[PDB]
Structure 1
Amino acid sequence: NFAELKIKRLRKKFAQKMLRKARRKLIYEKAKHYHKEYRQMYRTEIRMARMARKAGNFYVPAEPKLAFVIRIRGINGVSPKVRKVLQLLRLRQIFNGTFVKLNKASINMLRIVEPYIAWGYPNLKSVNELIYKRGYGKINKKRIALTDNTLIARSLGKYNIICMEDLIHEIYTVGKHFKEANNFLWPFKLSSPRGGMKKKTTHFVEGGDAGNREDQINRLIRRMN
């Protein structure tokens, strides 16, 4: 006589409540383990180099898995092939940013649109703030802000990417579900570089802004983010 369905509706609420606490603890401990990974990742590159240097040899480090490509040129007076490659990168606007994992079918595209992009190998802190500050998800093909973990957990949960930290781990350490985790991210709406561009029209090598800037994308990510 309602004594049953009083408590039964509470028993539901408690089971919903205790389940979030278990999901919170997992998110907390996945975040603690990636800290332990990034440490070991950062440490072993210095370690392998020191033992190369002790022996008198060289540790040629792993050619990078992951690039961050920023469009530097505008939308006006652009080649048809360059238009296509820029819009397959989802760089459809000036100072739009996307992560692009390196291979042969990546770089022969990035070298073909060299004059229209400034790209390089992003940091861990660069991948953090780009995902934290500028992080927007393509949910129902709508640019919805990543403010709770239940937007990444709902779209990317089937790949066990169930929080903001899992996404950062998936991008930086280019995971088996990088494509689905990176295509989830809307092309990053970055502001104009606060400090100034050197020269938009010429390559970075010849005192410009365009093309591959290996370590140096991070200085302009912080200039723009």
Structure 2
Amino acid sequence: PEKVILKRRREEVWAAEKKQKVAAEKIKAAENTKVIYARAEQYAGEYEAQDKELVQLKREARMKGGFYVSPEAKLLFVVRIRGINAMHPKTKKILQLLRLRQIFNGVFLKVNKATINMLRRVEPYVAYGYPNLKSVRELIYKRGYGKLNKQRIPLANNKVIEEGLGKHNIICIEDLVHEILTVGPHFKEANNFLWPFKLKAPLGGLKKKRNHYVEGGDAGNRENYINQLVRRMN
């Protein structure tokens, strides 16, 4: 029948085009994974160089007589530690902007004066500090979800980065981890891509959540100890 032979003609045409498409994407993926290998290589290299360099300048300044002052953290990890009941409405709006809309959410934040004075307002409600490399990488792997089409996607592969990002020159999970950790030009987009991390309740317990950390509690800066905490929120 003319109808069915025509239908199969188009079917064969599309079947040919899918085959050639998949061959092109195989070649593309083959070259793309070498690219990713290079990027991850030189990210590890430069992380290591920065860590050694800080030590080098600190000894150099000591031997020269004075002292070196470390350049403060560009990035904060903020996790909410109070329930959503009996909150002041200003606090409710501030937490809706910081994206901490449910207890034990943890978000990555630039340090700038607007943000840190927005944290000063909800300080009894948050625990925050300066994540280190292991913290950032293992959060983004073990609990990494993407705001793709407003839907949440489990970043279980490099592919989802290619759609959410990539207009921003982020292709891989290590590109994303770097460009967060060393707070980059595209950190706005590479962070609004992420979904507010869902954390476990803190294994080993917690201290009182009512006091500031300085008074013994948990809220506010624990500047580095957000490291010692994420290991138990995760």
**Aligned partners of 1:154 and 1:162 also within 8 Å:** no
Q: CA deviation at 1:150?
A: 1.1
Computing the radius of gyration from Cα coordinates, the structure with the larger value is 2
**Residue 140 (structure 2) aligned to one of 118, 126, 131:** 131
Alignment match, 1:171: 180
Tell me the secondary structure at the aligned position of residue 195 of structure 2. coil
Match of 1:110? 119
Tell me the CA shift for residue 7 of structure 1.
8.8
Offset at 1:80?
A: 1.0
1:50-89 correspondence runs (5 A): 50-89=59-98
Query: Residues 97, 7 of structure 1: CA spacing in aligned structure 2 closer, same or farther, 3 A cutoff?
Result: closer
Residue in 2 that maps onto 1:27: 36
Tell me, in whole angstroms, the C-alpha distance in 2 between the residues paired with 1:204 and 1:14.
57
* 1:16 CA drift (Å): 2.4
Is 1:157 the counterpart of 2:166? The answer is: yes
- Give me the whole-angstrom Cα distance separating, in 2, the residues matched to 1:113 and 1:146: 30
Alignment of 1:195-210 (within 5 A): 195-210=204-219
AA paired with 1:17? K
After superposition, the C-alpha distances for 1:168-187 in whole angstroms (9 at most, x for unaligned) are 00110001000100111100
State the one-letter code of the partner of 1:114.
E
Residue 103 (structure 2) aligned to one of 94, 100, 103: 94
Q: Percent identity?
A: 62
SS in 1 for 2:76: strand
Name the SS of the counterpart of 1:151 in structure 2: helix
The answer to whether 1:36 aligns with 2:45 is yes
User: Which of 46, 55, 67 is the equivalent residue of 1:46?
Assistant: 55
TM-score scaled by length of structure 1: 0.95
What runs of 5+ residues in structure 1 fail to find an aligned partner? none
C-alpha distance in 2 between matches for 1:71 and 1:146: 23
CA distance in 2, matches of 1:114, 1:13: 52
Q: Distance in 1 between matches of 2:97 and 2:188?
A: 13
Query: Can you give the 5+ residue segments of structure 2 that lack an aligned partner in the other structure?
Result: 1-8
Give the distance between the partners of 2:124 and 2:76, measured in 1 at CA.
17
Distance 1:128 1:18, change over 3 A: same
One of 20, 25, 31 as aligned partner of 1:16? 25
Structure 1 residue 11, shift from structure 2 partner: 5.3
**Deviation at residue 129 of structure 1 after TM alignment:** 0.8
| Distance in structure 1 (CA, Å) of the matches to 2:65 and 2:223 | 26
**Secondary structure class of the residue paired with 2:29:** helix
Q: Which amino acid letter does the alignment assign opposite residue 24 of structure 1?
A: T
Distance in 2 between residues matched to 1:111 and 1:35, nearest whole Å: 34
Q: Which deviates more from structure 2 when the two are superposed, residues 6-15 or residues 146-155?
A: 6-15
Offset, 1:18: 1.5
Distance 1:50 1:11, change over 3 A: same
Structure-1 separation of matches of 2:19 and 2:163? 25
Indicate the SS of the match to 1:118.
Answer: strand
